Design a protein around this nucleic acid. Structure first.
Ligand code: DTP
Ligand code: DTP
Ligand code: ZN
Ligand code: ZN
Lengths: 434, 430
RNA sequence: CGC
RNA sequence: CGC
């Protein structure tokens, strides 16, 4: 089989069935989507894309199931189970759009507030499209997979279930749905890859040692469910991982300028949406916000759309182009403040678009000259339990931030924007900004 | 000052003038050109672009020039001098085209064999274009630079001189011309040695920090040359070895070079049908964008995706080559050879080679089926000093086939071996 | 506001 | 033929 040499995992061995899924346009698309979205414009080392991360997730998913399979043959983990987990690891991010999280986290809710969309649902659709347009089903049979149920298994590891809700594997293998993405504690192999990979590219330092965690993991009975468990001695490695997670969020994922830049890209896309045409199945033409509705079109929707707007000459694209040009010139939106919702609702995606109006409609009655419209405000909604076993008894067990930026960079609008912001938070009973 | 946190160097401090140069479309362009070109298709960690490298080179350039001047005040090293050497470091790669070296190393020769072009020449043109499009001359003045002679000094660091052939700085500051690009020891190699090892997972045994703090300018044959300390000779060996490990394992990688030639082939078949708008509304091709910097500003690795996502029927041939890269149905390796004792093959003759292979001889193959790739790399000449006496010192040629059946593959092998006989080249191994 |  |  083939070896891919990754700076984080060294030599990666890929089963020939994984190679065939990788060597498709639907998987090679991930080479053109930056892992950290606009974070590259803030961190020059963060040039990595979804592709190499996905190889890493596919690789760690395998190492874990194969480690668990050797130390616990009573789990009856087949080599078909291994491949289904690796495929799910490879393919979990297939549905990511331009600038990863900025696309489904901010662009799609602002452009189509009525539509519900996640990158995970995109991954399922893209995976189904990847199989159908490349004849992967026979290659799966050739290598021992049973397509109808194994494809069901792979999709459920990605997006979740549609008593025991799953239908790809029975209850005696429930621990398999915990590897690729863990919806119950947030410890999965995908986190392991990008902690290490993002640290590597940001120059932040990573104390967590994923290999020791794999070496000592075990499946155990916890409330009559089979769950993967860490050794009781290894709590120190887990403390390190959580500290790395907190550093990456505080330093990189929630960086002030990096988030501002994400909203500028989203602004440019929104101004371009009516004029960019992406050709989907049958020659039908889609927009940036509607490419998610046709997988052929989505395949051709990547970070490229930044440069296609930046390089365009079309007069209708001028407004969008000038937003991208201000990023290059480093004339960004200006930070106004921050807040938190007090024991309150999740500010919901359907409401993201109404937010700039509320801020402008707020009444700071300490009245000054300048007044601002909704188009001048950006509102940024940033959305953000381990069982152990002792070695003497091996199968016995033991939120939202809201930033406001202003598109006008004068002293007076920024002074006024602050007054509107401080007023808006009182209206909704948010914490006082300062 | 503004700080940029880089994984190779930690914190980089940028003088306000450098920020002004960096925050232009001409410099930001470098975010959209892979440092290793097609090598990303073999090394998934090699996603790095020319931009981050260029910041490293400016940083390393300042470190060296600043450490010399503080340790040897007799060198008369101004802050004008430091800023100029930083700008030269920041901008030395401004002229790189799509997929870095694959552009001027193979494409421009195959598309316009008449013209003799280098990315360094592009960097001079792109720099001049950068300075005028963003009003950098007044900013240079408000920070103590004399633009007319300093722009010459920056240009000369990047491309070289047109007796003392330089006109940006006098001979008593000859050493300043050795920092950005040189004997082959300069800060540019230092950054990409470290940067490439970091993304490739190869180990870099050279420590540039140790070389920097122990470096001294000394007189050697009437010229002031930058000299390493005697005890750093072991560091120099490690430097020369990681350089050679990077070329043999990464830059001259077999599949990555094959992929580079597939992109080049795609570009030549797309060349007559892509239009890039340059100054005055004039239109240019991938091959002529080099003659107009406004157009060149918009020619990045994005030209790869424009072809790949194109629907024009006239771009189908180029599109299908790129689509063959995604599927991993690549050209096939036939063999390797070298011009032993022979005249090195020159760029102007690159396009003649695929027909010379079909020339020299059941199934027979035409020039269309042959790719000929010419791989170029480009002890002494480095002087050391002792502590007690601190002022005195002491081509590859590969052939690929486009038809991948075993019958055409064995045929192309014989075309190749015979072609080397006619041209006095080595007989390939197995 | 590439602290 | 991302040894
Ligand atoms: N708020 C965020 N939470 C988690 N990951 C984020 C966030 N913002 C950016 N990222 C990056 C971190 C990783 O590189 C990557 C993880 O993607 P996924 O697992 O799909 O969620 O996204
Ligand atoms: N033949 C080659 N020689 C040197 N560097 C090369 C070669 N091919 C690719 N590279 C890469 C190595 C560095 O990352 C970068 C050096 O760019 P340069 O302008 O030569 O300085 O290009
Ligand atoms: Zn992921
Ligand atoms: Zn360079």
């Amino acid at each position: 089989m083939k070896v891919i040499n990754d700076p984080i995992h060294g030599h990666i061995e890929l089963h020939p069935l994984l190679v065939r899924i990788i060597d498709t346009p639907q998987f090679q698309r991930l080479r053109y989507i930056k892992q950290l979205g606009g974070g590259y414009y803030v961190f020059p080392g963060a040039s990595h894309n979804r592709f190499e991360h996905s190889l890493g997730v596919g690789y760690l998913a395998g190492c874990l199931v194969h480690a668990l399979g050797e130390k616990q043959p009573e789990l009856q983990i087949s080599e078909r189970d291994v491949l289904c987990v690796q495929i799910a690891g490879l393919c979990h991010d297939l549905g990511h759009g331009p600038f990863s999280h900025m696309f489904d986290g901010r662009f799609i809710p602002l452009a189509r507030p009525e539509v519900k969309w996640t990158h995970e649902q995109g991954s399922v659709m893209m995976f189904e499209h990847l199989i159908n347009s490349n004849g992967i089903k026979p290659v799966m049979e050739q290598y021992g997979l049973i397509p109808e149920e194994d494809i069901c298994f792979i999709k459920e590891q990605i997006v979740g279930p549609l008593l025991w809700p799953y239908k790809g594997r029975p209850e005696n293998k429930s621990f398999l749905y915990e590897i690729v993405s863990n919806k119950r504690n947030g410890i999965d192999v995908a986190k392991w890859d990008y902690f290490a990979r993002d640290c590597h590219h940001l120059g932040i330092q990573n104390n967590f040692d994923y290999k020791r965690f794999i070496k000592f993991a075990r499946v155990c009975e916890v409330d009559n469910e089979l769950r993967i468990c860490a050794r009781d001695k290894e709590v120190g490695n887990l403390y390190d991982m959580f500290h790395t997670r907190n550093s990456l969020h505080r330093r990189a994922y929630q960086h002030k300028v990096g988030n501002i830049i994400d909203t500028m890209i989203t602004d440019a896309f929104l101004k371009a949406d009516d004029y960019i045409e992406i050709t989907g199945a049958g020659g039908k033409k889609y927009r940036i916000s509607t490419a998610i509705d046709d997988m052929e079109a989505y395949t051709k929707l990547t970070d490229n759309i930044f440069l296609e707007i930046l390089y365009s000459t079309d007069p209708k694209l001028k407004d969008a182009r000038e937003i991208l040009k201000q990023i290059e010139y480093r004339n960004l939106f200006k930070y106004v403040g921050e807040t938190q919702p007090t024991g309150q609702i999740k500010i919901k995606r359907e409401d993201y678009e109404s937010l700039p109006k509320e801020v402008a409609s707020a009444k700071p009655k300490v009245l000054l000259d300048v007044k601002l419209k909704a188009e001048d405000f950006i509102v940024d909604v940033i959305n953000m339990h381990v069982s152990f076993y002792c070695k003497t008894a091996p199968n016995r067990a033991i939120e939202q931030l809201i930033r406001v930026y202003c598109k006008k960079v004068d002293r007076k609008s920024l002074y006024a924007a602050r007054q509107y912001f401080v007023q808006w938070c009182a209206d909704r009973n948010f914490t006082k900004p300062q």
